Amino acid sequence: GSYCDFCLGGSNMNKKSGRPEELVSCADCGRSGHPTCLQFTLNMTEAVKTYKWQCIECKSCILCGTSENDDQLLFCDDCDRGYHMYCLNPPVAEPPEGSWSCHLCWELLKEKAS
């Protein structure tokens, strides 16, 4: 049943907890991982499960879909998106101190109600 790319358990067993959890298979390379291990959340988990998810490196800056200066390519926290700090609507200069949120996150933030 595959294994996650961080503890290498499976879609029904974590190696770091010993708890059942469905892995996420990258759509760019095909490697599996526990969203929890992926540092994700449930929204991210679901997101990857509903669309073409990428495992960090496979994660290209959707904004310009290049992933050039990836060393800036921020990491989303609700879906699994990736945006170059210098591509964002309000381009980042330095990795936000708190929990950064991609645009999908924001549009989802509003879409939550109304």
């Binding site: 294994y3 790319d5 961080f6 290498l8 490697r31 991982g33 291990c37 992926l38 540092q39 994700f40 495992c55 960090i56 490196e57 994660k59 992933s67 990836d70 060393d71 800036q72 390519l73 921020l74 990491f75 926290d77 990736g82 700090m85 980042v92 990795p95 936000p96 101190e97 708190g98 929990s99 950064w100």
Partner: peptide
């Protein structure tokens, strides 16, 4: 703000090299 660089990218792990 997990950025895609050395200092971070802890979600870029893909099974440790142990299976030869």
């Amino acid at each position: 703000a997990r950025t895609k660089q050395t200092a971070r990218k802890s979600t870029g792990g893909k099974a440790p090299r142990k299976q030869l």
